[PDB]
Amino acid sequence: EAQQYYLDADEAEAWIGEQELYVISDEIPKDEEGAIVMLKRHLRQQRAVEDYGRNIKQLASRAQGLLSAGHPEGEQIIRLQGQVDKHYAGLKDVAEERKRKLENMYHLFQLKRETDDLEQWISEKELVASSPEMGQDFDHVTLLRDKFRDFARETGAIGQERVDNVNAFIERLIDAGHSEAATIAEWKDGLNEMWADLLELIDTRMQLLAASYDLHRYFYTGAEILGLIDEKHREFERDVHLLGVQVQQFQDVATRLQTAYAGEKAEAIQNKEQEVSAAWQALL
Amino acid sequence: ATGFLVSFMVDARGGSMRGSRHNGLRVVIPPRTCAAPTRITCRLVKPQKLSTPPPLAEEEGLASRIIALGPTGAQFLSPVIVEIPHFADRELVVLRSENGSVWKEHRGESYLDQILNGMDEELGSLEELEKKRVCRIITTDFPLYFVIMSR
Numbered sequence A: 001e002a003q004q005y006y007l008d009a010d011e012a013e014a015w016i017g018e019q020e021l022y023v024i025s026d027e028i029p030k031d032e033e034g035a036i037v038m039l040k041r042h043l044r045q046q047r048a049v050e051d052y053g054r055n056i057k058q059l060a061s062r063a064q065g066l067l068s069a070g071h072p073e074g075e076q077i078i079r080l081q082g083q084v085d086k087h088y089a090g091l092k093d094v095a096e097e098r099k100r101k102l103e104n105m106y107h108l109f110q111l112k113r114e115t116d117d118l119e120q121w122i123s124e125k126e127l128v129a130s131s132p133e134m135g136q137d138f139d140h141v142t143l144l145r146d147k148f149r150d151f152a153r154e155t156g157a158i159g160q161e162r163v164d165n166v167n168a169f170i171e172r173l174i175d176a177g178h179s180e181a182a183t184i185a186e187w188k189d190g191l192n193e194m195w196a197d198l199l200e201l202i203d204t205r206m207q208l209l210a211a212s213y214d215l216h217r218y219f220y221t222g223a224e225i226l227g228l229i230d231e232k233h234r235e236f237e238r239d240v241h242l243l244g245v246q247v248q249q250f251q252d253v254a255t256r257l258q259t260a261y262a263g264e265k266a267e268a269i270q271n272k273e274q275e276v277s278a279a280w281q282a283l284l
Numbered sequence B: 001a002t003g004f005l006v007s008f009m010v011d012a013r014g015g016s017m018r019g020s021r022h023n024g025l026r027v028v029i030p031p032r033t034c035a036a037p038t039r040i041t042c043r044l045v046k047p048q049k050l051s052t053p054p055p056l057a058e059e060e061g062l063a064s065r066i067i068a069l070g071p072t073g074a075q076f077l078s079p080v081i082v083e084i085p086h087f088a089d090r091e092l093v094v095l096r097s098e099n100g101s102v103w104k105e106h107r108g109e110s111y112l113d114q115i116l117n118g119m120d121e122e123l124g125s126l127e128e129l130e131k132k133r134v135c136r137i138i139t140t141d142f143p144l145y146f147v148i149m150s151r
Helices: A002-023 A032-068 A074-130 A138-176 A181-234 A237-260 A264-283 B111-115 B126-132
Strands: B007-010 B015-018 B026-029 B038-045 B066-070 B075-085 B092-097 B104-106 B134-141 B145-150
Touching: A002 A032, A002 A074, A032 A074, A074 A138, A074 A181, A138 A181, A181 A237, A181 A264, A181 B007, A181 B038, A237 A264, B007 B015, B026 B038, B066 B075, B075 B111, B075 B145, B092 B134, B126 B134, B134 B145
Parallel strands: none
Antiparallel strands: B007 B038, B015 B026, B026 B075, B038 B066, B066 B145, B075 B134, B092 B104, B092 B145
C-alpha cells in the first residue's frame, strides 16, 4: 500500500512532466486564424490538466491517511505529496500563463483587423469628401448638394456606430488588463483623430456646396425675376408692389453675395443685379 | 479659438486660421486672393505614404512631414502665407512638388505689409519664427506637396 503510493506518485509526476514539457506548447500564432486554432487546442489541454486535479487530491488524501495511520515512512510519503502538489501547481500556472498569452495575441489580431478595415473605410469616405466637382448649372448643383447631404448623413450614422464599437472594444481589452494596452491606446487615438478629420472634411465640403448653391440660386432667381418684370410690362396694382418686394430681397442678396466674390465673378453678380434693377425701373 | 483640424472655408473677405491640433501651423488667406468661396484643406502626411518621397542627398534630412494644401493646383490672384512648424552644419530649404513625381526648391520680406492687403493680422518677425522654429512659405498657388528639409 505505501509501495503502491510510490508508483502512483511517480506516475502523477511523469504525467505532469509530460504535459508541461511536451503537451503544452510555446508556439506563437502568426495570425488570427492561427491564434484561434492554438487557443482552441490550448483550452482542451487545460481542461485536461484541471481534470487531473482529482487524481492529485485523491493521492494527497491517501498520503494523509497513510501518515495519520502512523506508517513507518509517513514523513517520506508526505514529502513526495508536497513535491507532487507543488509540481501540479506549477503546471496549472504555466497553463494559465499560456492561456493569458493566447487570448492576448488573439484579441489583438481581431482589433488590428477591425481597426484597419475602419481606417480604410474612413480613407475612402475622405476621397468622396475631397471632390472639387462644383456643378455647371443650378439643377446640377442642387443635385450634388442633395447627394452630398445624403452621403454626409449615411456616413455620419454608419461611421459613428463603427467608431463607437471599436472604442468600446478597445476599452474592454484595457479594462480586462492586456499586455499591449499602451499600443492599443495609440490605435484608439489615431482612429478617433481620423474620424474627427473626416467629419470636418465632410462639413467643409458641405459649406463649399452650400455656397455654390447660393451663387447658382441667385442667378436662377435673377432670370425668374426678369421674366416676371417682362410678363407684367407686357400686361394688378397689388401684384407690382409684391413683385417689388421680391426685387428688394434680390437687391439684399446681391450685396451680401458681393462681399464673398471678387473680379469677374463678383461683377457678374453686380451686372445681374443692375440688369434686374434697370428692368424694374422701366416698369415703375 | 477658431482653429482647424484639416480644413476651413474662406472667401474673398479673406481669412486667417491656425491648426487647432497645432497652433504653430498657420494659414493666411489675405482679402481678394481667391475669386469665390474656396475650401482650403491642409494635411500633414507621413513620408512613408508617397510613391516618390523627396530624394535625399548624403547629409540631407526632412525637417517636417509632407504638407498637402488643397485643392491641389489652386491658383490665387496674389500670394498666400502658410507657416509650417519644423524640427530642430546645415540649412532650411522648402521643397514642393506640383504632381508628386518631381521635387524642386521653392522661395519675401518687405512684401509682408503689401500682400496682407489691409488685413489686421500681426505677422511675426523672421527672427521670432526662427526661435519658435517655423517656416514661412509664401505662394500664389498650392502644389500637391511642400516639405521642409535641411542640407
